[PDB]
Amino acid sequence: PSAADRNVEIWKIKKLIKSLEAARGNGTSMISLIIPPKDQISRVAKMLADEFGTASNIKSRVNRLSVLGAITSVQQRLKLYNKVPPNGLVVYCGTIVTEEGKEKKVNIDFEPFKPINTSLYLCDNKFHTEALTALLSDDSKFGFIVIDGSGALFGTLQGNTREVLHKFTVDLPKKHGRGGQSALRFARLRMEKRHNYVRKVAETAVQLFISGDKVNVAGLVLAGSADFKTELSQSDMFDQRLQSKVLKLVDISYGGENGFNQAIELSTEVLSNVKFIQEKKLIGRYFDEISQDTGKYCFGVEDTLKALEMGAVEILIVYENLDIMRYVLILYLTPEQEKDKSHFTESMPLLEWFANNYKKFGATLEIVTDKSQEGSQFVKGFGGIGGILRYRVDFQGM
């Protein structure tokens, strides 16, 4: 588990989906192999073997060598895996026409984060990625609890997908009567049935939102009126992890189902901007180092790599674009790269590098955008690559 680390993974997918769809060679030489979890490898290995045997007959050298090579190619990757890992196995192999009309051979095998029963096996002119872009259906789901004086409600907002889950009700000690009983005796029974609501509710929500020893949602908004909910967050009969991710405390007029929409209308933004929020927060904290004397910061390629290479800098912050290429067929040059590169002595874009191997530096990679003042200044003003260090470091000249 681990968000932020989870979002680096999505980045790579989109990057891969991009290059994959940009390709298209010359006939049945494109293999898209997706293998669902638990399904069996040898089942696949045989089908491959079969396909190979059948292709062996083709007899049109060019067309025969084409199909054979593809199949060979994927078999050769498949042999590396001892069995489908969890989430499964995606595999792309084949020969494509690249720049200069030369041939390029693609070899991709790897485990994602869940493409079940997609079980795919196609040989075409193009790679088939619909399976990958689907992983890109990651809409954060939020939890709603809308209290009231006449009844509670629990539902979810996810994208534009509204969902009313459960809805019970209470009829607290309302009536007063004409002298027929004491005041205290009333207030008593009063701050008694509430507590027996402040519960049943705070209880019919843990038996809901937190399904499987973890909250099956990422936000949780408590909406109602007059502390009928503020006596629910800082409470004892509710909390436990759930009090931990209460995002908004929204005041509506008239609740239950009607106030659900009012809750949802109001909660959009913080919920439709969650990434930009944490993203602006992150970069802000960064700007903060730069501003105090504590100064545990770093930026620019040179010193970041330098700081990265040495000890442990807490979070590496990099812009999603980053006109900077890293070769060593090790340099780090922008598209200034059209100069006296005195020949060879793995041309990967720098961010592409940072992703595959940052897990081994001190952790946490944060790709950010310029869709804010914070990210625009992080880029326009500090080359969009810096880091939040864990102890001051001295950089000197150049």
Swiss-Prot record:
Modified residues (Phosphothreonine): T334
SMART domains per UniProt: eRF1_1
CC annotations in GO: cytoplasm; cytosol; cytosolic ribosome; translation release factor complex
A Pfam family of this chain: eRF1_3
Subcellular location: Cytoplasm
InterPro entries associated with the record: eFR1_2_sf (IPR042226), eRF1_1_Pelota (IPR005140), eRF1_1_sf (IPR024049), eRF1_2 (IPR005141), eRF1_3 (IPR005142), Peptide_chain-rel_eRF1/aRF1 (IPR004403), Ribosomal_eL30-like_sf (IPR029064)
UniProt keyword annotation of Nucleotide-binding present: no
TM region positions: none
Motif (NIKS motif): 57-60
Per UniProt, location of the Glycyl lysine isopeptide (Lys-Gly) (interchain with G-Cter in SUMO2) cross-link in this chain: K83, K380
Superkingdom of origin organism: Eukaryota
PANTHER family registered for this protein in UniProt: PEPTIDE CHAIN RELEASE FACTOR SUBUNIT 1 (PTHR10113)
Family per similarity comment: Belongs to the eukaryotic release factor 1 family.
Any one Gene Ontology BP term: cytoplasmic translational termination
Organism annotation: Homo sapiens
The keyword Ubl conjugation is annotated on this UniProt entry: yes
This protein's name: Eukaryotic peptide chain release factor subunit 1
4-hydroxylysine: residues carrying this PTM: K59
Function: Component of the eRF1-eRF3-GTP ternary complex, a ternary complex that mediates translation termination in response to the termination codons. The eRF1-eRF3-GTP complex binds to a stop codon in the ribosomal A-site. ETF1/ERF1 is responsible for stop codon recognition and inducing hydrolysis of peptidyl-tRNA. Following GTP hydrolysis, eRF3 (GSPT1/ERF3A or GSPT2/ERF3B) dissociates, permitting ETF1/eRF1 to accommodate fully in the A-site and mediate hydrolysis of peptidyl-tRNA.
Sites of N5-methylglutamine modification: Q181
